[PDB]
């Protein structure tokens, strides 16, 4: 089933700040905002953790779209291959979640990768979930849904139950 990260990195405060630093032309900004909020709450409802959106400066979870190299050692690779990636909880790059601008992202109303699904996966890694061996899990390593029992068991193992 579920994986964490080695030595169970996790947010050490009850409040975790997040910021959407860069948007996609594929979607209205407010749509990315609402879907990120929905993704975070799918995890947050299970655990004693609150998310706070900020619109400036450096939040704990920095979220954004980028093409090619974007300041970490994991440059994006244009259309196809890698779609997105995210970092275990920690300072700086830890918690951050990046989406490749060279794909197409949808709110469900158009053609594209489902951004809610993808953001729930990435933000799982942003909270300290690794990949699951359970094909029903949002944290399964490969790409209308809910967290699986495995997803919920894993996140509650790391943070405890709300």
């Amino acid at each position: 089933g579920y994986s964490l990260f080695p030595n169970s990195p996790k947010w050490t405060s009850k409040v975790v700040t997040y910021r959407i630093v860069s948007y996609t032309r594929d979607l209205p900004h407010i749509t990315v905002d609402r879907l990120v909020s929905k993704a975070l709450n799918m995890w947050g409802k299970e655990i004693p953790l609150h998310f706070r959106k900020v619109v400036w400066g450096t939040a704990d979870i920095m979220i954004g779209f980028a093409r090619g190299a974007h300041g970490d050692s994991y440059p994006f690779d244009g259309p196809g291959n890698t779609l997105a990636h995210a970092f275990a909880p920690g300072t700086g790059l830890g918690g951050d979640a990046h989406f490749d601008e060279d794909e197409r992202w949808t709110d469900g109303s158009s053609l594209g990768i489902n951004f809610l699904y993808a953001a729930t996966h990435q933000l799982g890694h942003s909270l300290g979930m690794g990949h699951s061996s359970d094909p029903n899990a949002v944290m399964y390593p490969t790409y209308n849904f809910k967290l699986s029992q495995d997803d919920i068991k894993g996140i509650q193992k790391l943070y405890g139950k709300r």
């Binding site: 990260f5 994991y74 970092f87 275990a88 790059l93 799982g124 890694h125 690794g130």
Partner: peptide, 5 residues
Amino acid sequence: XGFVX
């Protein structure tokens, strides 16, 4: 992709 760092 989930990375450490």
